[PDB]
Amino acid sequence: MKEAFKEALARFASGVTVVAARLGEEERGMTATAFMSLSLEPPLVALAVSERAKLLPVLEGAGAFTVSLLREGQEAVSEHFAGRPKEGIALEEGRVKGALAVLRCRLHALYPGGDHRIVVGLVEEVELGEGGPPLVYFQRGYRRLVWPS
Amino acid sequence: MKEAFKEALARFASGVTVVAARLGEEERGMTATAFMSLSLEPPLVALAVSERAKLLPVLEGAGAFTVSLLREGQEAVSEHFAGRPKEGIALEEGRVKGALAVLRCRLHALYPGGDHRIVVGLVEEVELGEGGPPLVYFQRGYRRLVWPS
Ligand SMILES: Cc1cc2nc3c(=O)[nH]c(=O)nc-3n(C[C@H](O)[C@H](O)[C@H](O)COP(=O)(O)OP(=O)(O)OC[C@H]3O[C@@H](n4cnc5c(N)ncnc54)[C@H](O)[C@@H]3O)c2cc1C
Ligand SMILES: Cc1cc2nc3c(=O)[nH]c(=O)nc-3n(C[C@H](O)[C@H](O)[C@H](O)COP(=O)(O)OP(=O)(O)OC[C@H]3O[C@@H](n4cnc5c(N)ncnc54)[C@H](O)[C@@H]3O)c2cc1C
Ligand SMILES: NC(=O)c1ccc[n+]([C@@H]2O[C@H](COP(=O)([O-])OP(=O)(O)OC[C@H]3O[C@@H](n4cnc5c(N)ncnc54)[C@H](O)[C@@H]3O)[C@@H](O)[C@H]2O)c1
Ligand SMILES: NC(=O)c1ccc[n+]([C@@H]2O[C@H](COP(=O)([O-])OP(=O)(O)OC[C@H]3O[C@@H](n4cnc5c(N)ncnc54)[C@H](O)[C@@H]3O)[C@@H](O)[C@H]2O)c1
């Protein structure tokens, strides 16, 4: 079921992020396309994390997390943090190295979201990688932007 | 202000949507990139609408709204509903005709989101348009996806 809903959302293109959190001995990363800018004042971003995600309890307990925006060529990173292991993929300094950008957030608020939890982060630090095209997901596949334009 | 934050978010590619609501014959439309799939069961989507958006009052009052996913070549529609009026642009049946897809939602919840409000919609109807490339926004500009024949 939900074929129509999925076909519709498959038609919404987006960049790809890796959301990560560290709580004690555990540090987890998870691939997420459900990400969006939320506020400028204060600087907030919103994400939807599955209630079934192992990342969730870690992020909740940590009270802070990072969001790395993947660039073109990082499909392997996305696949790895999406549950399809790739050799040698790892987080460095709590985030994805070589990403277009990294947002280090303090957990600002959480809200119910059906089978997902709405996670709101207050951006406290911003890391900017070198400019370039992003990793894009649209219609059930990784895509590239016609770049430059 | 918030130069780094803006630069980072400009690095998150996304499709472009037009959110609309109506109270009788008073109908408002607003361009938005802050949109994401939220839940499958129930089928929910989330978006961020500025607290100063004229659309918000109507959306709350209506308790329902639509989200149209724009396709490649609809930059004019995006600009129009972004506050820069264009010729011959109008909502039809409460949404944008000729879009990749339209989601007709019932307002499910409203949560605090800084200078924006988190709008959660319960998808009650889905409309799909012809297939094809989407309208993408990235690095302060409309972009096209590599999608050759
Ligand atoms: C394009 C795409 C977009 C997606 N968007 C979303 C979304 O917006 N929201 C959502 O809830 N789900 C999304 N998913 C699915 C989601 O990624 C999987 O359901 C989820 O990753 C499983 O995550 P988990 O935290 O439960 O961890 P696990 O099931 O354990 O999966 C995490 C994977 O990441 C690896 N990993 C975890 N931590 C580390 C670490 N510290 N170092 C190295 N490797 C590590 C693991 O080896 C494992 O394979 C998306 C999937 C794809 C393919
Ligand atoms: C690429 C892009 C992405 C954006 N994403 C977001 C976002 O995610 N969230 C956000 O809050 N803001 C976003 N904005 C800015 C936002 O679009 C403007 O702040 C907002 O449109 C002003 O909305 P308003 O509802 O107050 O209406 P207005 O300032 O009145 O703007 C709405 C425009 O739509 C037209 N319009 C309204 N109703 C109708 C109708 N029934 N028929 C025909 N035309 C109509 C108007 O003529 C007007 O020009 C984005 C802007 C751009 C350029
Ligand atoms: N937001 C998410 O939770 C999310 C986003 C994309 C991918 N995924 C996972 O990857 C699989 C493949 O995705 P695809 O886009 O290639 O094909 P798909 O047809 O399974 O999904 C199409 C779109 O529908 C939405 N969606 C699908 N499953 C969802 C879920 N469980 N919760 C919320 N939204 C969902 C997402 O926007 C997804 O991109 C999905 O079935 C899901 O397991 C999860
Ligand atoms: N989510 C939003 O509210 C949103 C999204 C994009 C565009 N816009 C409007 O269009 C203008 C141009 O944007 P641009 O991307 O071409 O260059 P920009 O540098 O002005 O914006 C960069 C990115 O930061 C985020 N952002 C910017 N202003 C925001 C705001 N007021 N609230 C929440 N997030 C914000 C968005 O993701 C935007 O794409 C922005 O200044 C803004 O007025 C608003």
Structure tokens at B55: 């659309």
Distance CA A62, CA B48 (A): 25
Give the CA-trace dihedral at B101, B80, A42, A108, to 10 degrees: -10
Q: Give A83: exposed, middle or buried? Use CB within 10 Å, 0-12, 13-18, 19+.
A: exposed
* C-alpha distances out from residue B34 to A27, A45, A56, A104, B66, Å: 28, 10, 22, 19, 14
The method recorded for this entry reads X-ray
The response to whether residue A17 sits with its C-beta less than 6 Å from ligand 3 reads: no
Residue of A1, A14, A106 to mutate when probing chain B, most B C-beta within 10 A: A14
Q: A113 and B126: CB-CB below 8 Å?
A: no
DSSP character at residue A9: H
With b meaning 16 or more CB within 10 Å and e meaning fewer, what string describes A37-50? bbbbeebbbbbbbb
Note the resolution in Å, 1 decimal: 1.9
B15 and A13 Cβ atoms separated by less than 8 Å: yes
The hierarchical CATH code for the domain B1-149 is 2.30.110.10
Three-state secondary structure call for residue A114: coil
Distance CA B118, CA B46 (A): 7
* C-alpha distances out from residue B83 to A58, A76, B18, B90, B131, Å: 41, 39, 12, 13, 28
B21 and B28 Cβ atoms separated by less than 8 Å: yes
Q: Which among B52, B37, B63, B146 is positioned nearest to A147, based on CA atoms?
A: B146
Question: Tokens 């990784």 sit at which residue?
Answer: A142
Distance CA B130, CA A100 (A): 32
- State how far residue A40 is from chain B, nearest Cα, in angstroms: 7
The response to whether residue A34 sits with its C-beta less than 6 Å from ligand 3 reads: yes
- Is A86 known as a binding-site position? no
Three-state secondary structure call for residue A87: coil
